[PDB]
Design a protein around this ligand. Structure first.
Ligand code: NA
Length: 129
């Protein structure tokens, strides 16, 4: 499923991401736009043999099991295919674990390089929230 901007803002708010760990909804919407172009089915192979999955491009090196990332962890306790669902629940639950420790939203390269420090509130402009 390819979400619209305001459609994804509404889904992320319902699933409890607005101000999760102090990150406003616009940060999450911006991160999804530049990680996946709002596409739940997005996948990208990494140099280390891991793969990034779904609307927030969550990696199999740490977060999910895809059966082809030897020596990796599964800290979200899910198959990576769960991150490609039209339903964003599994991606949101896993994103909440990722953001809660380590480097916060810096874990998302597209967020750090394309959203951090910008007017991220613009990403929710015009949305019925
Ligand atoms: Na893994």
């Amino acid at each position: 499923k390819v979400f619209g901007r305001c459609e994804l803002a509404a889904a992320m708010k319902r699933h409890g991401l607005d101000n999760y760990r102090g990150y406003s909804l616009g940060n999450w919407v911006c991160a999804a736009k530049f990680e996946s172009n709002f596409n739940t089915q997005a996948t990208n192979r990494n140099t280390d043999g891991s793969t990034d999955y779904g609307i927030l491009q969550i990696n199999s090196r740490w977060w999910c099991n895809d059966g082809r990332t030897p020596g990796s962890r599964n800290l979200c306790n899910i198959p990576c295919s769960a991150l490609l669902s039209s339903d964003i629940t599994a991606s949101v639950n896993c994103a909440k674990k990722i953001v809660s420790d380590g480097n916060g939203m810096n874990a998302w390269v597209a967020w750090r390089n394309r959203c951090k420090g910008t007017d991220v509130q613009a990403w929710i402009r015009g949305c019925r929230l």
